[PDB]
Amino acid sequence: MEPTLQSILDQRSLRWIFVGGKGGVGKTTTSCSLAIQLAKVRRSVLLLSTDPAHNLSDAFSQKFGKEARLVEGFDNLYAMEIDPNGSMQDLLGVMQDLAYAIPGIDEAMSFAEVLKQVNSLSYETIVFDTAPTGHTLRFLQFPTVLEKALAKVSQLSGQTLSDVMEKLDSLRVTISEVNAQFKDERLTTFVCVCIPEFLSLYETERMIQELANYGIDTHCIVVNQLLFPKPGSDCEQCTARRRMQKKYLDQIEELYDEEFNVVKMPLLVEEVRGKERLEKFSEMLIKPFVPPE
Amino acid sequence: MEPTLQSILDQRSLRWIFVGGKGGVGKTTTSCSLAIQLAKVRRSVLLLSTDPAHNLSDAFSQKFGKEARLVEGFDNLYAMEIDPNGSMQDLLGVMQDLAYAIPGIDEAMSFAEVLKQVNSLSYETIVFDTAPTGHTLRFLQFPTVLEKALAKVSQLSGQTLSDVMEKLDSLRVTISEVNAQFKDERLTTFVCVCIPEFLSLYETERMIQELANYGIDTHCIVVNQLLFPKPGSDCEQCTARRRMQKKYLDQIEELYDEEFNVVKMPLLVEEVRGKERLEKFSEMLIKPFVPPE
């Protein structure tokens, strides 16, 4: 297929973008490259991170906190790396016993109020990045968890309880509309990343069929660190490493060449930071570099 | 701790050795290196493989089948790469409906009759290699599966059924004695392998706490492809690759330096085959190579 992300630019009715996978892949570099190349043709784009690695500070050498702002060099870069434990600081005895009754409560309510603040403004599009997957995909379960929790709190009742009852009802209707906005597929998309070895491909296919069991498609898949040989210069270990990399590369060619896209992105010698260097790294997601192979 | 496998040589009352992990690590090279260095001080050692990759043929360029034999260059190398589907060929209509009633039947009975043939001879020690783990660890569940299946077959009964009833009882008592020999820990040991990246370490720790939930310890852990710099010569990609490899290496140093062993094994330029080359590869499991680091 087309080895670029031109189809994400072309729709323009998209609103929500999910991008993930597993660690050891540098998803933050992919995220910032997506956002910057998105900003060339967009109006109001917001980045959101929840990984405990405070990596956007490393991305721009500028401290961020619990409020959005514009960072230098851009008129549209807004982001706020947040913590879920601040809501637990909001919990700091009966509500903690409720957290014993259901092992997950506060993270969904925090994500809820976050998304209310998200829909407070009039931003054009947003993007995401997440933790390992077993800790991610629970957000499709947050509406049900919220319902069960509210029912249980009411079960114990059988300070004012009606205030938290109405608050949880507002969280219920809000999360139902947002998950309902998820399956629309005209504003919600999903891209996953991986790297040429076994296990990365393994959990990648597990993720794909996972989203297949929820009725959300995809069409674009990015890989990373695809080493291509330098003309003339050679490392002898790098030769066999290229050989094995081609071996899995052609296997992914045997799978996804029908209805998905493959993004070739080579590793550079440095961890690419700085604005202009990230621009050059982001440029390749439109113009695919191709040596004679 | 001691960076070798000297403690496995020193006990001599050991009988069973389990070695595993995940793909992409070359466990067969580790297995043959273990067996050959084991044969220097042993009497009757048997290798057993069940992975559908018929890799011992690649290990010695000699076709093997469903019977043990001695291979050239050795007086003690015996192995037979077997298939579980031959027992399904033994099944080739009611027994297949029984396989519908329980999704796993024939693999445990095949492994059972295999182990009866194992205890037919008077061999000193044996070794193993397995598929991915979710397909492995069911062997600790085979005794229970066998019991449930036999009970169910009898439930339907409520050709001769008593013959298969007595056959399954013999399989029951045999598998109960073998699993009972497992937790003895004076003849059953376990070593796992991994490589310096994230996910390999991840599922490695998952395996360790898995065996912790069955009451089987370990003390020895091997890694692979640990690239050490050549004096004078350098590849610039290899420098940063060494840097990241050290980063995870020191993290494993922060975990296992208390009561486990670390085996440093470097990658060579070729897939090490042939007897004498495998001897040189196997030598390092006793004498650990150490550059100045």
Added chain:
Amino acid sequence: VEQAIELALEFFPAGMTLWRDVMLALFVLGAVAWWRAMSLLLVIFLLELVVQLVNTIGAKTINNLLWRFYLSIPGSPLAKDFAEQRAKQKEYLQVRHDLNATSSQDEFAKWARLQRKHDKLMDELEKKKSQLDAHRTSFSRKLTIYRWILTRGMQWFLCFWFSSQPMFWLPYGWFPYWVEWLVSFPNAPMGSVSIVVWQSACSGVLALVIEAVMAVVR
């Protein structure tokens, strides 16, 4: 409700044989009274084999007869889908053999296509198990009562109808008035017998013959 967990917590604090012998003697005189002496005795004769099958009941094995009852009719929809179930199961095990025979290295695309067909059919497998086992246990629960009506309707009709109509007359003067009291309650004329001991205690008559079969096979 169970009267057993209540008994599990109760630990926390601190004529009939001679009755069966006289029913044996009245069954002896009832068996002697037929040779020197009609249709109602054959009605009790069939109810004896009904109570026998009640004894030698296989409450599943009756439905094991119902299995070949519905392994018989070719116009049955469910046995048709039962055959389609086994056909899909055969294709299931076929691809599973081709799966476990394959390698996860060099047919990884073929690996995934097999894996996808595997969990494709794995979900539709137990849908039929939910369908047919529901139909089977509901059909059993219907026919248990369907037989039970034919059993106990004859266990109470005999006492409803043909009660005043005397079945047979007791010899004059053998039993005291208080014993004769039993006859007075079902409307049968004094000096004749009703139809009760043939309902319940006649089950003992064949019961020893049941243990005779216990000596036959064992």
Added chain:
Amino acid sequence: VEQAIELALEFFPAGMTLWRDVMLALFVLGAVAWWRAMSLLLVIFLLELVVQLVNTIGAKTINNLLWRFYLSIPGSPLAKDFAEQRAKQKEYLQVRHDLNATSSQDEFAKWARLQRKHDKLMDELEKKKSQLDAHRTSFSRKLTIYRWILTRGMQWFLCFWFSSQPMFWLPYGWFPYWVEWLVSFPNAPMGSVSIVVWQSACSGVLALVIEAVMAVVR
């Protein structure tokens, strides 16, 4: 047994108001008969509030009273372990905050030590839930019958004892003989009343006052 799945498969094939008004009139004459005229009427008076609590029963909320009953005694072993349970739960949530706050990159050893303590306490958590919820539902099942004995023992003792002893005498000539029949069965002298309508239908006397409270709050 349920008579509901049997009704779920039954779909496959194809005076009391005037009775309560006369019990109202006899309760009017029983209430008038006390002013111009003892202890047994107060016994019925307490059984009326017992039947009232039977009506305004919270079968859980009685055990909600039992909760503060056992939130009271300091020598209780179980409420002691209940406090130890909440203490372990507090340390549980504390390490869970320190877990989710940590990073999986640069404290991977600290990561594992936290994870190990996490699933360390996670298993002992529901062991107490298995212990105490078992004790609580068994204690409820004890005291349900423990109250039920004090209820129905007085619901049948009144009819056992003080039956021949007449409670009060009916006016001579008001009721036909067949109505008077009721008195003859409990051994009370003819012309006096027994103690039945005070047991069952006196529950209706306060029942309208129950709906009076239904107008009070609502």
